[model samples]
Every structure is written in structure tokens, then in C-alpha cells.
Target: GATKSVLFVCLGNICRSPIAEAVFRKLVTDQNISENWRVDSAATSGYEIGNPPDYRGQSCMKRHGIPMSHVARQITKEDFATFDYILCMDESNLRDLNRKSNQVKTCKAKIELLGSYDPQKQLIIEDPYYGNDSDFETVYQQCVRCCRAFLEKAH
Candidate 1:
């Protein structure tokens, strides 16, 4: 019963990554496999560190009955060595994580784009920070699809 750990990343921890983390958590919890996974999210930058997830993202999750609680934090050196997988939002996030992981001597996480798991082939989770509620909903929907596919593959 080994635990599988995943860390989701975005430019800021307040939006996309949080949604992905929440969606994946719900998926595993619903399947009664929560104990078999370690789920978390982070930012590739320090833009929103120490803050709660963005209000719009929070509201979006609330609308869908998904509970999300996380303080924004930047990806750290230790994360590269610890997480089994480091899944990121867009190309920028992917490049940043890859660059950071290279600086770590014992980097172990397999860095990848979260959208790579998307069945719909949407390979980038765009930032919706400046957009309206519909944008947040889009991010949420993408997270649901990608997270669902990632979990299925994890099995």
C-alpha cells in the first residue's frame, strides 16, 4: 500500500493548481483511496505566497461542492526531492519546474504538464486571474477532466 504523492504547480498557487489539487483530492476520496495518495499544490513563483487561493477560484470550487483549503506557497528545493510527481499548469510552469529541478542534486519528482493527462487534448491550463467567473469555471472544468484522467492512469 505505497502512497503516491503529487504536487500541482502554477504561476501562482491561488488558482489553477489549487483547482487541480482539489479535483484530484475529490476523485481519490470518492474512490475511497484517499489514504493511498498525498495531494498538494504550489506555485512556480512567489507572487501569491502566504495567501489563500484566489476568491474566484474559491467561489468556483464552492459552487461545485468541492472543499479546498491551502495557503499559497512557492515550489521549493525539497519538493523536487520529495514529490513523486510535479505536475504544472502551462508551458511557463513546466519550464520553471524543470529549470528548478535541475538545480537540485537529488531531484526525484517527474515534472510534467498537468494538461498532458487531459483526454480532450487541452494541453495548457491558462491563467484566469484577470477574467470573469466563467474563466474560473473553465479552469475548474479542465481540472476535473485532467485530474480524472491522471487518476485513472495512476491505477
Candidate 2:
């Protein structure tokens, strides 16, 4: 098997992306395969750059025992050339990343919806930044399903 990496992206990196990043990281860690992959989260926009994951997201992760730690950041051109998979939360993120990739000289990553790996057939993981705790839980549930399936397939 080859060494690989994945970047989870969203509108602001404070919500869905961070959870997905944490969930995926925990998945690999639990399987004792963390050494073979690099996992991270980023934003399609920089509105919350340098900010940590949203409180709601942090709370949800804590409930499930996943340690979430990621300062929000915008997706860099360098991200495009490095990560093996550039998985994102929804269609808007897909559009934004595709548009941004146009400015870079070479984009080696496979930009895809993280939901595309969902076994539940839910095709989008909606942003939960403006919603309540239940919404954050839904995002976490989706990430759990999607990330687990993604890891299985990626492995």
C-alpha cells in the first residue's frame, strides 16, 4: 500500500470539516493505521482562519470521545498538490474548491464529496454552524458513516 493523505474542507472549517477530520483521524488511530496517512481539515473561505473548531462541534466530538483539534484555515494551493484526497462537506464546497483549483498550476488531489462515501446514501453533509446541537449531531453521524466507509475503501 502507498502512503496517502486526505483533507476535509468546508465553508469555514469550524463545523463539519473539523468533525470529519477528527472522526477520520480517530478511525485510523483506532485501527492502528495512523502512521500511513495524513488527515486534516480546511476551509473554502478564510472567514474563520486561525479560529478553533466551533464550540458546538467540539462538544459533539467530546460526547463521542473524539479529540477535535484544528484551527480553521483556508485551503491553500499547496493543499491541491499534496493531498491524495480532497474530500469536502457539500456541493458548495465542491464548487468552491473546483473554482480555486483553476488558479493553481497543478492539482493532484481528487476533489470529492465526503458524503459520496456514505453507506446511508445521504449525499450531502450540511453545514451546522447556524443550527443547534441536534444539527451538529447529524453532521457527526454523517461523518461517522462516511468516514468509516471512506477509510474502508481507501485502505
Candidate 3:
């Protein structure tokens, strides 16, 4: 697609999306696409918008050398027009993001499930906010897989 920027989205800004952002950013950088593209993340909802990543996610990412103290933010309508892709974590995020675009023609195109690129793990990245620490590990691995696949497809 030759896209330049992508936005990863989740329910809360502090958890899933940030992990995706950090991991994807690293993926593209390692591939030497960092100069041509940029990756960031946000939440569909305003929950935890000005906060840093959740403590659990922060610690988990730190173990793997991924930064987790990302600044949290809420997805804005402008983001729909700003980024090349706006990938949502799940069905709930799709609905939430739809509310911003009012389901425009390109809306469905921009809003994709995070796993859309990963054929192996087609399910959505789970929310670890309500679940235990193991959930984060599962999602972390999923993020690693899916984000790499996304980079491959993007180029």
C-alpha cells in the first residue's frame, strides 16, 4: 500500500494499543522502514487518555526491551483522516471507531482488526485489563506475530 503512518487502537490507551505501537514501531525500524513510516496507538474511548501504560503492561514490555511508558491518548476524528491505517483490536473497537467516522465509505478500509494481517492467529488481541497477567503474555506474543505480518503486507 505504500502507507506512511498507522494507528493501533484498543479499549484503553494504556494497555493493548501501546504494546502494539511499541512492537510495531520496533518491527518497522528493524526492517529499515522507520524513516518512511511511523506507528502510534490510541484508545477508542477516553478511558486512561492522559495516563501512562498500565503498570503490568509496562513491566511486561520492559522484560522484552520494548518501551511501555507511552503517553496514552484517545482516538480523535482527525485521526481517521490523518493516518494511513487505523487498526482496531476487536469488534468492540470497530464499533467504537465507527462512531467517529459515522461509517464512511473508507471507514471500513481504515478500520481493520489488528490480526487482519496474521493468518495464524485470526482472533482479536484480548483485553488483559480484566484478565490476569497471562493474558498479557498471550497478547504480547500475538502482537509480535501480527505486527510483523502487517509490516510484511504493508510493503
Count clashing residue pairs per candidate.
0, 0, 0
> What tens-digit string does per-residue lDDT give for candidate 2 at 1-155?
53989999999999999999999999898888999999999998889999998899999999999998888999999999999999998898999999998889889999999999988898999988789999999999999999999888852
The residue ranges of model 3 lying beyond 4 angstroms of the native Cα positions read 1-3, 103-109
TM-score of 3: 0.88
Question: Against the correct fold, how does model 2 do in TM-score?
Answer: 0.96
Point out where model 2 deviates above 4 Å: none
Task: Identify the runs in model 1 with alpha carbons over 4 angstroms from their true place.
Answer: none
Alpha carbon lDDT of each predicted model: 0.89, 0.91, 0.80
TM-scores for all candidates? 0.95, 0.96, 0.88
> RMSD for each model, in Å, please?
1.4, 1.6, 2.7
Positional deviation of 39 in candidate 2, in angstroms?
A: 0.4
Candidate 1 residue-wise lDDT at 12: 90
- Tens digits of per-residue lDDT for model 3 on 37-152? 85889987786878998887887798899855588888776778778888878899888787878844344236788877776855788788886778888888888888888777
